Design a protein around this ligand. Sequence first.
Ligand SMILES: O=S(=O)(Nc1cccc(-n2ncc(-c3nn[nH]n3)c2C2CC2)c1)c1ccccc1
Length: 289
Amino acid sequence: VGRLIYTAGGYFRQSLSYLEAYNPSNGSWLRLADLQVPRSGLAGCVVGGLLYAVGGRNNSPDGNTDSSALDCYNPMTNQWSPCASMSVPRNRIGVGVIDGHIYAVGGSHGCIHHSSVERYEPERDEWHLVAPMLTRRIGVGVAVLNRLLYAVGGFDGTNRLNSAECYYPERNEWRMITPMNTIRSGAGVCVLHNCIYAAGGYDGQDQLNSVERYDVETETWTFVAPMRHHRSALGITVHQGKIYVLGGYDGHTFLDSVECYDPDSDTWSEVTRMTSGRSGVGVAVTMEP
Ligand SMILES: O=S(=O)(Nc1cccc(-n2ncc(-c3nn[nH]n3)c2C2CC2)c1)c1ccccc1
């Protein structure tokens, strides 16, 4: 009990510093301490009950600055603290956690599209590079299942991608997996039960509402019910056996919609609205502050 869905940063007109937390048990939102630097295109994750904001870009009137930053929010104090920075700025990043370590995957720095990957050790406050992906990927969806790290879709600088790959830590090696049925860049990717879900994204022409899942045993991708709203640059997380998608861009509006997927019924429902529409947030779940 006592866990909230935290949304950090995002974009509406400019990059945002908001940190807000939604309580599924009572529908409430809390506004918490702002990020030190506004950022969109970041990712969130949690290790040891602390929330981390990783990478992104500050789109502002004074300029556009890609972020190498790692910042840590402690719900007990409602304070952000800087951590060691990554080796390189990474906007439109994906992150995943394996055994207490944060993997930062891909992303962009100006016109550079990264294949590089680095791993953070909270106990030592150090980053180190690991093997790079087989493909350069920005807007990459990342998730961890059974202590394996998946990188899904994205944009390589020329093509939006349906391809996906998996990192096997004990071999420090990436291998391609079955490609998705749909090209998706800037999708939401998460794990639920024994599958990697990819929701929404942009296929080069349209924002998507379709959702597909990769069963890691059978190596197949299967479509599930589509979301009510097409969305790119959505936030995504899992909480108590359901997927939550937050915001994004539908080609017309920066959405405030939050939808929730129930895998038992294979249905999506609208569960709340963010306090304002935005895209490009980072999202994770930890204890209330
Ligand atoms: O400020 S945003 O939130 N930035 C952002 C954040 C997270 C991921 C991505 N992302 N990553 C690769 C691509 C991409 N692939 N092919 N074309 N585009 C994108 C874009 C399409 C969503 C972008 C922002 C979003 C939508 C409209 C205006 C601003």
